[PDB]
């Protein structure tokens, strides 16, 4: 038969989901960033845990070790490119200081809210899922889309959107036709 196609899980359930502090933290995160459910927080936590475990393992190694240099430089480059890590904090020690809020900060929903295209994180989510937001020339309908530093200045309304210069949506032209009639 055909060769297998690989897959993986992008999240893991926390150790003790019922800690009251954990529930309150999840409440605050979901409210601040307009997340749908706890699975999104678990996904971001899983990714950040992998990153910080890798950084800790590299820090264990001796300085100038080829594996440490190579893999740590790659990790720092990726984190700086996605915007989570600042340009002035290009060290693994600052990689260990990262938090889930830093990754939620780069989601397309938060960026769309902050750039002023939307009046709320939930308005930003509705705009993104309704095909009104374009990063560059591409329409992106994924709220979890992680924006890079270069892409940040290219978020705008899509050319096809009613808010981006196209004709009015069905509701507007329907009401106009009724009013004219």
């Amino acid at each position: 038969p055909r060769a297998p196609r690989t897959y993986s899980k992008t999240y893991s359930t926390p150790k003790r989901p019922y800690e009251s502090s954990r529930l309150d933290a999840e409440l605050k995160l979901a409210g601040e960033f307009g997340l749908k459910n706890k699975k999104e927080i678990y996904r971001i936590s899983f990714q950040l845990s992998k990153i910080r475990r890798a950084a800790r393992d590299l820090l264990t190694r001796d300085e100038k070790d080829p594996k440490r240099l190579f893999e740590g430089n790659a990790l720092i480059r990726r984190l700086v490119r996605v915007g989570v890590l600042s340009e002035d904090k290009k060290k693994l020690d600052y990689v260990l200081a990262l938090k889930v809020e830093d990754f939620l900060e780069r989601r397309l929903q938060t960026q769309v809210y902050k750039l002023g295209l939307a009046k709320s994180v939930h308005h930003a989510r509705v705009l993104i899922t309704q095909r009104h937001i374009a990063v560059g020339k591409q329409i992106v309908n994924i709220p979890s889309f992680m924006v890079r530093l270069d892409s940040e200045k290219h978020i705008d309304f899509a050319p096809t959107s009613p808010f981006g210069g196209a004709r009015p949506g069905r509701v507007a032209r329907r009401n106009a036709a009724r009013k004219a009639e």
Binding site: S86, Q111, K114, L115, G116, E152
Partner: protein
């Protein structure tokens, strides 16, 4: 010793004018000496940028007095023609104010320039 002090160098001026332009697009910029004065009274200013070539310079010298009472960083740029262009308006600007917003998209850039102005002072 000169009344307009501290005056930012060529390298620092461009970074200040960079942040001013981004703040203008994000509606985080208050243009004009009068509007800058109101922000200081309300305590909603990150820092104040003034033009050192104002004719006369005295019509914006109340802002340093308000800034130093309120512990708000302030800096002078050589040209008001350049400041007005960066502000996004069609006229020269002698003073401008960056509005405080911890939920802004250009927070890191603002604090970067804010630190260097504090070092300058």
């Amino acid at each position: 010793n000169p009344k307009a002090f501290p005056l930012a160098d060529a390298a620092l001026t461009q970074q200040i004018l960079d942040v001013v332009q981004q703040a203008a697009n994000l509606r985080q910029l208050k243009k004009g000496a009068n509007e800058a004065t109101k922000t200081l009274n309300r305590g909603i200013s990150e820092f104040i940028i003034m033009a050192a070539d104002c004719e006369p310079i005295e019509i914006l010298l109340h802002l340093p007095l308000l800034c130093e009472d309120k512990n708000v960083p302030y800096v002078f740029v050589p040209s008001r023609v350049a400041l007005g262009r960066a502000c996004g308006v069609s006229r020269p600007v002698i003073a401008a104010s960056i509005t405080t917003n911890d939920a802004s998209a250009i927070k890191t850039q603002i604090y970067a320039v804010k630190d260097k102005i504090e070092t300058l002072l």
